[PDB]
Amino acid sequence: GSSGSSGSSTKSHQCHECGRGFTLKSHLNQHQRIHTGEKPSGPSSG
Ligand SMILES: [Zn+2]
């Protein structure tokens, strides 16, 4: 059976916060920002 092996790869640099993929590390790095900002003051939505 082996009904599992849940571990594929679509792009070198992949995000864990949402699950996006980027070819150039930089790309993702800038993207991840969406998940982590600059400890801003305010109500963090869901
Ligand atoms: Zn992400």
From residue 38, alpha-carbon distances to 33, 34, 35, 42 in Å are 9, 10, 10, 11
Lookup: tokens for 6? 């849940």
Q: Give the amino acid at 35.
A: H
Domain span at 9: 1-46
28 Cα to the center of ligand 1, angstroms: 8
What's the domain count of the chain? Answer: 1
What does the alpha-carbon distance between residue 44 and residue 38 come to, in Å, rounded to a whole number?
12
CATH number at residue 39: 3.30.160.60
How much of the chain is in helix, strand and coil states, percent to nearest 5?
A: 15, 10, 75
Give the C-alpha separation, 14 to 26, whole Å.
11
| Dist. CA 30 → ligand 1 center (Å) | 10
In angstroms, what is the span from residue 20 Cα to ligand 1's centroid? Answer: 5
Ligand 1 center to 38 CA (angstroms): 16
